[PDB]
Design a protein around this ligand. Structure first.
Ligand SMILES: *[C@@H]1O[C@H](CO)[C@@H](O)[C@H](O[C@H]2OC[C@@H](O)[C@H](O[C@H]3OC[C@@H](O)[C@H](O)[C@H]3O)[C@H]2O)[C@H]1O
Ligand SMILES: O=c1ccn([C@@H]2O[C@H](COP(=O)(O)OP(=O)(O)O)[C@@H](O)[C@H]2O)c(=O)[nH]1
Ligand SMILES: [Mn+2]
Lengths: 299, 35
């Protein structure tokens, strides 16, 4: 049989002496592996971006969890955060001042943009990868998410779920102020509430092959849009995708909210009581819970 | 990581060095929209 590879990617850095992160990782990876099923000729590739201390932590966690019950072939790969940072920087430098905490352009923030230039960082033998946070809980077989790739319309490069808090209502304040009729920052079903980067289907081939996407990476395009939108953030890739998603929604296949059910309610308590519900509403059978802002996941 | 700026103006991080006013979202007041 011709062996079929599946690729996932998780950030796992500064994990030594960070027990809350290790426990998050444990919850994520154990639910992931318990519920995954793959055919005999299929292999699950788990990519981790780690410095060397977090690599050893991850290996200790992984040996306790592998091989999986379901018995499918699983391969672990580590990528050096320092090597990726240096590769990302030329591509990612100019966007850093708009989307990092806070000013200006530091190496330590570069890795938060990994997804935006993943198509240039991963071997070309990797056509698609799903980047996932480690504060997740999987309620289904991860193999099912991969069929969302087939629903990408012509010209879409990335699959992503909506942001479930009014953080972008707040962020786009001045643009909203100047454009009373905009849907930028409004709740669903009809508004553009922005994206959450916890679960992302990165079609590396489509990204590589998109002339629009490639232009949007260029310093002067990043600058023109952040100026148009008066955009300032500190959430990295999420911010950049959210922003270019306002200009060019065709780039994004929007996933059902059930694939990334965010639980964070920080913004409810910081100025958005009245509208919070319209952003946070998510109905349907939950496939992945996302315990963002350290929010405990229900069981 | 920084804590989000509760103010509607300035940078994304709270206590933005380059900000002097704090425009709070409705129903909040204080130098960090506390009350
Ligand atoms: C404002 O600051 C507060 C206090 O530090 C944060 O809790 C807020 O961030 C929360 O609310 C908005 C979410 O977008 C955010 O979760 C995202 O963070 C970036 C990605 O790493 C991640 O995949 C995504 O879930 C959440 O932590 C902040 O807006
Ligand atoms: O010290 C850190 C902080 C974050 N992360 C990774 O980056 C993601 C973003 O942080 P987190 O999910 O805790 O915050 P959220 O943005 O979801 O509130 C995490 O899932 C981790 O995979 C990490 O590896 N080390
Ligand atoms: Mn998360």
């Amino acid at each position: 049989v011709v062996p079929v590879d599946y690729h996932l990617l998780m950030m796992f850095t500064k994990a030594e002496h960070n027990a809350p992160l290790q426990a998050k990782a444990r919850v994520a990876l154990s639910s992931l592996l318990r519920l995954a099923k793959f055919e005999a000729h299929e292999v699950l590739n788990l990519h981790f971006v780690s410095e060397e201390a977090s690599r050893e932590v991850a290996k200790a966690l992984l040996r306790e969890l592998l091989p999986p019950a379901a018995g499918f072939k699983c391969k672990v790969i580590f990528h050096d955060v320092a090597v990726l940072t240096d590769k990302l920087f030329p591509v990612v430098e100019a966007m850093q001042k708009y989307f990092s905490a806070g000013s200006g352009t530091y190496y330590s923030d570069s890795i938060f943009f990994l997804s935006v230039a993943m198509h240039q960082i991963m071997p070309k033998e990797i056509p698609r990868i799903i980047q996932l946070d480690l504060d997740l809980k999987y309620k289904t077989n991860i193999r099912e998410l991969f069929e969302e790739f087939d629903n990408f319309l012509p010209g879409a490069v990335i699959g992503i779920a909506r942001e479930m808090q009014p953080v972008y209502r707040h962020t786009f304040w001045q643009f909203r102020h100047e454009n009373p009729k905009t849907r930028v920052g409004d709740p669903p079903p009809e508004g553009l509430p922005g994206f959450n980067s916890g679960v992302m289907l990165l079609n590396l081939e489509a990204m590589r092959q998109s002339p629009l996407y490639s232009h949007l990476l260029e310093p002067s395009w990043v600058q023109q849009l952040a100026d148009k939108y008066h955009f300032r953030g500190h959430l990295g890739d999420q911010d950049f995708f959210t922003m270019i998603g306002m200009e060019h929604p065709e780039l994004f296949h929007v996933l059902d909210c059930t694939w990334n059910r965010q639980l964070c309610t920080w913004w409810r308590d910081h100025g958005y009581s009245d509208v919070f519900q319209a952003y946070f509403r998510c109905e349907g059978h939950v496939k992945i819970y996302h315990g963002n802002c350290n929010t405990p996941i229900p069981e | 990581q920084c804590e989000s700026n509760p103010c509607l103006n300035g940078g994304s991080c709270k206590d933005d060095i380059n900000s002097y006013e704090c425009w709070c979202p409705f129903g909040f007041e204080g130098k960090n929209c506390e009350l």
